Design an enzyme around this catalytic site. Structure first.
Site, PDB file in Angstrom:
ATOM      1  N   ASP A 170       0.836  -1.234  -0.029  1.00 16.43           N
ATOM      2  CA  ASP A 170       0.163   0.206   0.022  1.00 16.43           C
ATOM      3  C   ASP A 170       0.982   1.376  -0.164  1.00 16.43           C
ATOM      4  O   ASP A 170       1.768   1.294   0.800  1.00 16.43           O
ATOM      5  CB  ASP A 170      -0.866   0.263   1.250  1.00 16.43           C
ATOM      6  CG  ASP A 170      -1.670   1.488   1.213  1.00 16.43           C
ATOM      7  OD1 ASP A 170      -2.024   2.030   0.371  1.00 16.43           O
ATOM      8  OD2 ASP A 170      -2.040   1.813   2.392  1.00 16.43           O
ATOM      9  N   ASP A 172       0.806   4.884   0.795  1.00 18.80           N
ATOM     10  CA  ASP A 172       0.076   5.566   1.611  1.00 18.80           C
ATOM     11  C   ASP A 172       0.214   7.198   1.413  1.00 18.80           C
ATOM     12  O   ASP A 172       1.304   7.665   1.353  1.00 18.80           O
ATOM     13  CB  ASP A 172       0.506   5.368   3.335  1.00 18.80           C
ATOM     14  CG  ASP A 172      -0.360   4.248   3.601  1.00 18.80           C
ATOM     15  OD1 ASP A 172      -1.346   3.797   3.311  1.00 18.80           O
ATOM     16  OD2 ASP A 172       0.432   3.290   4.279  1.00 18.80           O
ATOM     17  N   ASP A 221      -6.240   3.175   0.131  1.00 19.63           N
ATOM     18  CA  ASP A 221      -6.768   4.331   0.958  1.00 19.63           C
ATOM     19  C   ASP A 221      -6.371   5.776   0.771  1.00 19.63           C
ATOM     20  O   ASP A 221      -5.579   5.820   0.144  1.00 19.63           O
ATOM     21  CB  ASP A 221      -6.389   3.614   2.394  1.00 19.63           C
ATOM     22  CG  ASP A 221      -4.936   3.182   2.705  1.00 19.63           C
ATOM     23  OD1 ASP A 221      -4.047   3.875   1.786  1.00 19.63           O
ATOM     24  OD2 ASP A 221      -4.490   2.452   3.285  1.00 19.63           O
TER      25      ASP A 221
END
Lengths: 447, 286
Positions: A170, A172, A221
């Site tokens: 991921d 971020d 996210d």
């Protein structure tokens, strides 16, 4: 005339009494939607697809239909609430896509693994997913160089740009336009992968949003942050990208080890944090000139919990202008008390600190958000006292104040320590709220 | 002459440090009532934004009609990226500039204990922010309104509320009552001698901490407020470097300095000048 015509064209029929009364105020946006050049848009989507999802089992016609099919669904929608959704989401595409993902067309812009291992082991003191992610990460790689001002990275990837021997999945980020970027991304994916994607907002998280696929598989996210915050967030320029200063990320890590879930994940596989920790320690050693040497010299600024009021008092006079810091474990309570003090000036940094900071008649007021570990009956465990210092230090950096002596001392105090068992821990406060979402194929938005 | 210099304006009732005896003998701006509401709610919502409580919240405004100013609040936070769901309930209709918006639900109904329960089961588990500007006034009317406001809170269990708060006159006292604990925000641009304030509350988790209001409290209210409206509000704050040194703009300055903006400004005075102009241009106040 203008109103009725605009609406009549968009809906593909004479606006009904009700439809015209409602949409009447949308005429403007509706115009942009009608006038928008789909042909150009269809191309950008294809160029984006070929460049970041070349391996996505699809052939043009499919994509072209999805897109045109969508900019025309108003036509077969009679529910007024669904209509507002379609026009809201069409508007985000008509007004932002090109600037956010379109631009992505012509791409333009150690040895202390030892010391890390030591600090980590002493801390491991306690009792124990979409296929579209490669594609989205490669895209974010380009995205971060093209949007230095609105997007900035933190976490693994960021440290990976400083030391390649860091794995990462991921990527971020913190942004000033999360809702938009993600909606554009959600659409892009939806158009390339014919089958639906759903983004949702998680309560108990500050300005957070995620895009998931059809089966609940997390895709990516993001945290929305206002320009005010973005500006004061300690950053660094690396590879045409902005990275949250490793120094500041180091502080967050310290803060997080106070969370039970963190230590638990730690015992699962200690070596995980080693590489990251090691990299961040080197950066600080080299960049700020911090030296390691059992320099514990008064560390845990000294913390005391007030069991009943869920407030930890932190003596801070041997470091900062303020005598002490009152760390509340209940945000609503902290907010109520700050309001009782008529203080309408509290410094807030949203997701970055997960709390406001206020300095009144010489005292600091703040909230923690992480569990508070205990050594014995009513005693803060060093891991949390240390975690409490980091929290306070975050504020110093965000306000460009004094933050090196204690950051050094804090780090040293983590050296040559003995694992200290956890007797208990406070529970974090309940953060109520609805799990909002955006279901594109269902034309629903609920918050 | 009658000018004055102050460190800060009176933000909350408890800060008013003086009193005068009311005189049964005693606004001059267009849409002033709208500006009053706009500033206080912008200040309220803004505080909630600052303390992390506004994000993803449903704002329930009861007695919002006509609520023209709400369109400005809505657009303000919308453009800041703050996710909010607005719900306006009123026996009467609101301004049409509020219709045709996905994020705002207009309800034309007179609320009663019954209806409240219903919308709560509907909203749940959404986090609720309550703004009450309800009315009918006589002391008996006020008590009924306040009693109603207390049922609202207890039913909706909002994380925070802003309630219209005006103590009954001492000479028109009936009996004692209870209101939610909170800060009593003073309102700039309020009518020349209005003693109406805004009760701001951020709740814990049990009680809504009800405190009693007495005739003795009603007297202090009237005094303090008459002193503010009669003495303070009629001054020019000479140490206030601003196009308008009227005290009301001074008070407004300190409310707006807390508001957030995407646009960056050198000084705070540049931000405030920007917001005031935006606000006046919107309210159509020259």
């Amino acid at each position: 005339n203008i109103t009725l015509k605009i609406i009549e064209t968009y809906l593909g029929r004479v606006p009904s009494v009700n439809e015209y009364h409602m949409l009447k105020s949308q005429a403007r946006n509706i115009q942009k939607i009608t006038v928008f050049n789909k042909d150009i848009f269809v191309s950008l989507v294809k160029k984006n697809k070929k460049r970041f999802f070349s391996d996505v089992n699809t052939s043009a016609s499919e994509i072209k239909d999805r897109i045109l099919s969508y900019f025309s669904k108003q036509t077969q929608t009679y529910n007024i609430g669904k209509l507002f959704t379609i026009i809201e989401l069409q508007s985000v595409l008509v007004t932002t896509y090109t600037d956010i993902l379109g631009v992505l067309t012509i791409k333009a812009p150690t040895s202390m693994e030892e010391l890390a291992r030591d600090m980590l082991n002493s801390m491991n003191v306690a009792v124990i997913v979409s296929s579209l992610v490669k594609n989205v990460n490669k895209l974010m790689e380009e995205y971060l160089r093209r949007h230095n001002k609105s997007c900035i990275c933190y976490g693994s990837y960021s440290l990976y740009l400083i030391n390649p021997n860091i794995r990462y999945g991921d990527i971020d980020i913190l942004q000033t336009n999360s809702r938009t970027f993600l909606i554009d991304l959600a659409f892009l994916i939806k158009f390339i992968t014919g089958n639906n994607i759903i983004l949702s907002k998680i309560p108990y998280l500050r300005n957070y949003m995620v895009i998931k696929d059809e089966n609940d598989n997390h895709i990516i996210d993001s945290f929305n942050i206002r320009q005010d915050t973005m500006n004061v967030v300690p950053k660094i320029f690396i590879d045409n990208i902005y990275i949250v200063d490793p120094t500041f990320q180091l502080l967050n890590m310290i803060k997080m080890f106070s969370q039970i879930d963190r230590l638990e994940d730690l015992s699962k596989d200690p070596e995980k944090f080693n590489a990251r920790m090691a990299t961040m320690l080197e950066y600080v050693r080299y960049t700020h000139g911090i030296v390691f040497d059992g320099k514990r010299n008064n560390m845990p600024m000294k913390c005391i919990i007030d069991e009943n009021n869920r407030i930890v008092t932190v003596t801070t006079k041997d470091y900062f202008s303020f005598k002490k810091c009152l760390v509340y474990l209940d945000e609503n309570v902290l907010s109520s008390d700050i309001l009782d003090l008529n203080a309408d000036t509290s410094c807030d940094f949203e997701s970055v600190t997960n709390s406001v900071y206020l300095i009144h008649d010489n005292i600091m007021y703040t909230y923690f958000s992480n569990t508070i570990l205990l050594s014995d009956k009513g005693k803060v465990h060093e891991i949390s006292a240390r975690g409490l210092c980091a929290h306070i230090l975050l504020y110093q950096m965000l306000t460009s104040g004094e933050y090196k002596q204690c950051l050094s001392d804090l780090l040293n105090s983590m050296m040559n320590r003995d694992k200290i068992p956890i007797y208990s821990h406070t529970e974090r406060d309940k953060k109520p709220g609805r799990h909002g979402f955006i279901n594109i194929e269902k034309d629903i938005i609920v918050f | 002459m009658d000018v004055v210099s102050l460190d800060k304006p009176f933000m909350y009732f408890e800060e008013i440090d003086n009193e005068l005896d009311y005189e049964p003998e005693s606004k001059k701006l267009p849409y002033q009532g709208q500006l009053k509401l706009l500033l206080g709610e912008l200040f309220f919502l803004s505080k909630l934004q600052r303390h992390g409580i506004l994000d993803g919240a449903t704002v329930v405004y009861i007695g919002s009609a006509p609520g023209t100013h709400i369109r400005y609040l809505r657009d303000h936070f919308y453009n800041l990226g703050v996710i909010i769901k607005w719900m306006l309930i009123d026996g009467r209709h609101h301004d049409p500039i509020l219709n045709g918006l996905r994020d705002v639900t207009l309800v034309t109904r007179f609320v009663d204990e019954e209806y409240l329960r219903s919308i709560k089961k509907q909203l749940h588990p959404s986090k609720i922010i309550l703004i009450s500007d309800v009315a009918s006034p006589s002391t008996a009317d006020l008590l009924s309104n306040y009693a109603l406001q207390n049922v609202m809170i207890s039913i909706l269990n909002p994380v925070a509320s802003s309630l219209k708060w005006r103590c009954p006159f001492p000479d028109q006292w009936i009996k004692d009552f209870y209101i939610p604990h909170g800060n009593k925000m003073l309102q700039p641009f309020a009518p020349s001698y209005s003693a109406e304030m805004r009760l701001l509350s951020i709740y814990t988790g049990e009680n809504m901490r009800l405190t009693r209001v007495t005739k003795s409290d009603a007297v202090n209210y009237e005094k303090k407020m008459y002193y503010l409206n009669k003495i303070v509000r009629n001054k020019v704050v000479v140490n206030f470097d601003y196009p308008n040194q009227e005290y009301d703009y001074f008070h407004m300055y300190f409310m707006l300095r807390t508001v957030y903006c995407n646009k960056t400004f050198p000084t705070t005075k540049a931000k405030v000048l920007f917001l005031q102009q935006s606000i006046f241009r919107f309210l159509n106040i020259p």
